[PDB]
Amino acid sequence: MQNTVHIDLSALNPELVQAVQHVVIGPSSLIVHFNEVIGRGHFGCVYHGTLLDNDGKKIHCAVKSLNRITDIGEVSQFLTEGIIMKDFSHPNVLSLLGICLRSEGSPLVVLPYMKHGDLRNFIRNETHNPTVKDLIGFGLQVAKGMKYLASKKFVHRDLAARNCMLDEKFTVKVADFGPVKWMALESLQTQKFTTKSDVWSFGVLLWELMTRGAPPYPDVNTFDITVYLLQGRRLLQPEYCPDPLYEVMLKCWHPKAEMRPSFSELVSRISAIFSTFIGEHHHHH
Numbered sequence: 100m101q102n103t104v105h106i107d108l109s110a111l112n113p114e115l116v117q118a119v120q121h122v123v124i125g126p127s128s129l130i131v132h133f134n135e136v137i138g139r140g141h142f143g144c145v146y147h148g149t150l151l152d153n154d155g156k157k158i159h160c161a162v163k164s165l166n167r168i169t170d171i172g173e174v175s176q177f178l179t180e181g182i183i184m185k186d187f188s189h190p191n192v193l194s195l196l197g198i199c200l201r202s203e204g205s206p207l208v209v210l211p212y213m214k215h216g217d218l219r220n221f222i223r224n225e226t227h228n229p230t231v232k233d234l235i236g237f238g239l240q241v242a243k244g245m246k247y248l249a250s251k252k253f254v255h256r257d258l259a260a261r262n263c264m265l266d267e268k269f270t271v272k273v274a275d276f277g278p279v280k281w282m283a284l285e286s287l288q289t290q291k292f293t294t295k296s297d298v299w300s301f302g303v304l305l306w307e308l309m310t311r312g313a314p315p316y317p318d319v320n321t322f323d324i325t326v327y328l329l330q331g332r333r334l335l336q337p338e339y340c341p342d343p344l345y346e347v348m349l350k351c352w353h354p355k356a357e358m359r360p361s362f363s364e365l366v367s368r369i370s371a372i373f374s375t376f377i378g379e380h381h382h383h384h
């Protein structure tokens with residue numbers, strides 16, 4: 100039976116199994132709402148979950164599972180993915196709550212629940228219609244999360260609005276659901292990624308925010324993005340986007356990687372722009 104698979108934890112890489120052992124969740128503290136699916140694919144599924152804290156109070160979570168398991172390699176990759184987040188501790192970066200290892204079945208990767216889902220779908224929703232200032236604030240939040248990750252020498256490689264999520268307090272968490280329109284020029288040419296190519300992707304993400312989730316380069320199938328960028332062309336300034344914020348976008352797309360601002364510089368510059376735009380806003384950024 101597929102629900103009787105038993106994983107030999109001693110087959111896993113020693114550093115991986117040490118990391119998993121520090122984040123174990125006892126099954127008695129977790130209710131997986133197997134009938135409440137957040138998202139499903141061929142290989143995995145994410146469910147609503149309830150964690151019971153040490154007072155018996157409820158923590159809403161999301162619980163990742165593998166579907167059918169046939170080899171230890173699938174399990175190792177699944178756990179390695181979860182453990183990426185283990186040492187992330189920042190308000191603007193998605194964290195790992197832990198890993199639940201029942202006797203049988205898939206290991207379960209437990210994450211804090213993000214009430215408002217991914218940032219791109221959130222800002223595209225016509226009944227959310229976020230204000231200019233709140234969109235700037237979301238960008239500032241992403242910049243703060245990326246400043247933290249860059250300080251840990253973590254290169255994201257797929258920063259985009261679709262990979263950020265928004266929780267109940269409207270805190271943005273940089274994440275990766277697991278991308279040529281977001282890639283730096285040098286990454287398109289060499290397939291090498293750095294923090295400076297994350298800065299390029301952040302520029303595109305800011306553009307996504309200020310267009311309320313318009314697809315960048317919508318005609319991409321009709322031209323070559325490398326040629327476009329080599330000839331100096333860039334995404335055009337969104338309507339209602341403040342001029343200094345568009346200049347920030349342009350700096351992120353400098354053809355010379357070393358000339359792009361650091362994420363520390365971006366936090367300072369966007370915080371200045373946020374502070375002087377006096378408009379309606381709702382969220383704590």
Ligand SMILES: Cn1ccc([C@H]2C[C@H](N(c3cc(F)c(NC(=O)c4ccnn(-c5ccc(F)cn5)c4=O)cc3F)c3nccn4nccc34)C2)n1
Nearest residue numbers: 137138139145161180183193211212213216273274275276
């Ligand atoms: C076809 N389909 C569409 C959707 C899905 C499922 C649901 C979706 N889902 C989700 C998002 C993630 F983003 C993750 N993330 C990771 O598993 C992860 C692994 C390793 N490293 N990072 C990371 C973190 C920070 C960083 F800088 C770089 N990487 C990760 O984020 C897991 C999820 F289940 C959630 N949907 C709604 C609400 N919530 N609430 C918590 C999680 C989610 C996925 N399927």
